[PDB]
Amino acid sequence: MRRVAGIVKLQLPAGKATPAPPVGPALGQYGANIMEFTKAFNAQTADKGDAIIPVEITIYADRSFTFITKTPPMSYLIRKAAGIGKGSSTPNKAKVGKLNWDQVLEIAKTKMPDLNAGSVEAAANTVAGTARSMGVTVEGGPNA
Amino acid sequence: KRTKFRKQFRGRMTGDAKGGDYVAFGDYGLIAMEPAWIKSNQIEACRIVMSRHFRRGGKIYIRIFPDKPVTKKPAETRMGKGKGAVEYWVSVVKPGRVMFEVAGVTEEQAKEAFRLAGHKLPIQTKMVKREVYDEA
Amino acid sequence: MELTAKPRTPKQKLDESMIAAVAYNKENNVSFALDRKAFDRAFRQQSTTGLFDITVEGGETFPALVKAVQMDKRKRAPIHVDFYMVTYGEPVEVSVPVHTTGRSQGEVQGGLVDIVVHNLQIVAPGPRRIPQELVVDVTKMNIGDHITAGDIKLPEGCTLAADPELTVVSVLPPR
RNA sequence: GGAUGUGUCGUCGCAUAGACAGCCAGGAGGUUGGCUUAGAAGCAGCCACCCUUCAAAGAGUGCGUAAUAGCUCACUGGUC
């Protein structure tokens, strides 16, 4: 209908086909096409499969869309790396698990243009720092 | 609140407050300014007030205590035939005497929980911090 | 510190802001009066184990630890001070505030760092090398552990006038 | 109970290393943190505040949205 651009940061499930709560008219109310995102986003979830990969969408006008599909915050393949499916109630009164430092090389090698750090120690210590609110204790530290 | 068993009855008088004008049990402490009386509910008030504010749960020291029986005659009789039945109970708080001590919370929590406390009382009041060191 | 007067009549001061006074050497005892300002300053600086000097308006510097303070219960300011002029080698039974050190593991599971004795009556280091405070690590304590006067530390050459089993700083449960 | 009324004493802090305020720009990536939830993603309630870099930037404070997004500050630098 119109031409008034938009910069929309969102978040969407991987291999499904979103119902009413997420999208619908959540980014299509400016002006975009849905037919080639139900069949164009659910096909690259045949790449990385089963984790909440983040999505960003920029909208021009008419029926135009240009999206980017980032890196899944492995709060899915780490919750499993313990024993609980739904995360800890309170990270300091009830815990989850204890990942190895080598399961900190799949969050520090999938996030190459995300964890805007230079070194490996930094890019590990980042989401290892995330690995504290999840309610998890680190099999790491000095020495060992 | 109320007590257990006793004498029954009373009277009244004033002139400054004995002890204990010192900050024990806590880091922060609220102190009366007027020769009041204080009632069971008047203090249970501040109990429930501050105990709202501190959440779970602080550490709260009610340094005062109702021991005084105050009466009122049955409403509508001409005097004589008796002394009034025991209406309510009273702590005879005199000035400089300290009513509330708390800690296990910060300075802001003392200021505020004491503010809300003192907005429930017949007295102007001052809150402060320790140093009264004759005996801890 | 420094005074000027020592009579029985206090109109030389008071309004002019000085504190009623005594200080005894134990063979030498003297009444006097010392300006409020300085006394408050130093006494919160140095307190009940402070030790400080008395250069009377005459010229006779003295060695003074602070012994007893007595204050206007209403206005809540001090009006009088008892001193103890220190001797030499043997002193007295110093009163010293227990503190707490480190982020304790006792406050991570809902508990609280409660000092069941804010102040400690020890015995004698020597009246020139006195502990001002104390340092009781609390980290090892969980919820339900107390610290008796045995577990309390020492700096060497000192003894504890307090029963070695009564409770100083103990963690309390939540709510 | 409330008040930058107006005089007096005193505490505390801040800056000749650029201050309180005026205007200028970031106010960041993990991270919708986890819990909770019809959805809470800074912000309805329950335990916790960890890192990436930096001239600086804190699971942040308000208005907000059913929830988003979005607007201001805590700090940071130019100015005076």
From Swiss-Prot, chain A:
Q: How is it modified after translation?
A: One or more lysine residues are methylated.
One GO biological process term is: translation
In its keyword annotation, does this UniProt entry include Ribonucleoprotein?
Answer: yes
Keywords, alphabetical: Methylation, Ribonucleoprotein, Ribosomal protein, RNA-binding, rRNA-binding
Q: Which SMART domains match?
A: RL11
Q: Specify the domain of life of the species encoding this protein.
A: Bacteria
GO CC terms: cytosolic large ribosomal subunit
Q: What Pfam family is a match, any one?
A: Ribosomal_L11
- MF terms in GO: large ribosomal subunit rRNA binding; structural constituent of ribosome
Q: What does this protein do?
A: Forms part of the ribosomal stalk which helps the ribosome interact with GTP-bound translation factors.
Relate the assembly described in the record.
Part of the ribosomal stalk of the 50S ribosomal subunit. Interacts with L10 and the large rRNA to form the base of the stalk. L10 forms an elongated spine to which L12 dimers bind in a sequential fashion forming a multimeric L10(L12)X complex. Contacts the CTC protein (RL25).
- Which family is this protein grouped under? Belongs to the universal ribosomal protein uL11 family.
Q: What is this protein called?
A: Large ribosomal subunit protein uL11
Q: Which species is this record about?
A: Deinococcus radiodurans (strain ATCC 13939 / DSM 20539 / JCM 16871 / CCUG 27074 / LMG 4051 / NBRC 15346 / NCIMB 9279 / VKM B-1422 / R1)
The organism that produces this protein has a lineage beginning with:
Bacteria, Thermotogati, Deinococcota, Deinococci, Deinococcales
UniProtKB/Swiss-Prot annotation, chain B:
Q: Recite the UniProt keywords alphabetically.
A: Ribonucleoprotein, Ribosomal protein, RNA-binding, rRNA-binding, tRNA-binding
Enumerate the CDD domains for this protein: Ribosomal_L16_L10e
The reply to whether Ribosomal protein figures as a keyword in the UniProt entry is: yes
Listed transmembrane segments: none
Under InterPro entries, the record lists:
Ribosomal_uL16, Ribosomal_uL16_bact-type, Ribosomal_uL16_CS, Ribosomal_uL16_dom, Ribosomal_uL16_sf
> GO: which molecular function terms?
rRNA binding; structural constituent of ribosome; tRNA binding
Q: Which GO terms describe its biological process?
A: translation
Looking up PROSITE patterns in the UniProt record yields: RIBOSOMAL_L16_1, RIBOSOMAL_L16_2
Instruction: Decide whether keyword Metal-binding is in the record.
Output: no
- What Pfam families does the annotation carry? Ribosomal_L16
In terms of superkingdom, the source organism counts as: Bacteria
Q: Please provide one cellular component term from the Gene Ontology annotations of this protein.
A: cytosolic large ribosomal subunit
Q: How does it assemble?
A: Part of the 50S ribosomal subunit. Contacts the CTC protein (RL25).
Q: What does this protein do?
A: Binds the 5S and 23S rRNAs and is also seen to make contacts with the A and P site tRNAs. Interacts with A site tRNA mimics, and is probably one of the key factors, along with a helix of the 23S rRNA, in positioning tRNA stems in the peptidyl-transferase center.
Similarity section: Belongs to the universal ribosomal protein uL16 family.
Put simply, this protein is called Large ribosomal subunit protein uL16
Q: What is the lineage of its organism?
A: Bacteria, Thermotogati, Deinococcota, Deinococci, Deinococcales
Curated annotation (Swiss-Prot), chain C:
What are the protein's UniProt keywords? Answer: Ribonucleoprotein, Ribosomal protein, RNA-binding, rRNA-binding, tRNA-binding
Q: Which GO terms describe its cellular component?
A: cytosolic large ribosomal subunit
Q: Which domain of life is it from?
A: Bacteria
- What's an example of a GO molecular-function annotation for this chain? 5S rRNA binding
Q: Does the keyword rRNA-binding apply?
A: yes
Annotated region Middle domain: where? Answer: 105-175
GO annotation, biological process: translation
User: What exactly does this protein do?
Assistant: This is one of 3 proteins that mediate the attachment of the 5S rRNA onto the large ribosomal subunit. This protein has three domains. The N-terminal one is bound on the solvent face, the middle domain fills the space between the 5S rRNA and the L11 arm contacting the 23S rRNA while the C-terminal domain is on the edge of the intersubunit interface and contacts the A site. The protein conformation changes upon binding of a tRNA mimic to the A site, although the mimic does not interact directly with CTC itself, consistent with CTCs presumed role in moderating A site binding.
Q: What family classification does the UniProt entry report for this protein? A: Belongs to the bacterial ribosomal protein bL25 family. CTC subfamily.
Q: How does it assemble?
A: Part of the 50S ribosomal subunit. Contacts proteins L11 and L16, the A site tRNA, and the 5S and 23S rRNAs.
The molecule here is called Large ribosomal subunit protein bL25
Q: Which organism is it from?
A: Deinococcus radiodurans (strain ATCC 13939 / DSM 20539 / JCM 16871 / CCUG 27074 / LMG 4051 / NBRC 15346 / NCIMB 9279 / VKM B-1422 / R1)
Q: Which residues of the parent chain are present?
A: 1 to 175 of 237
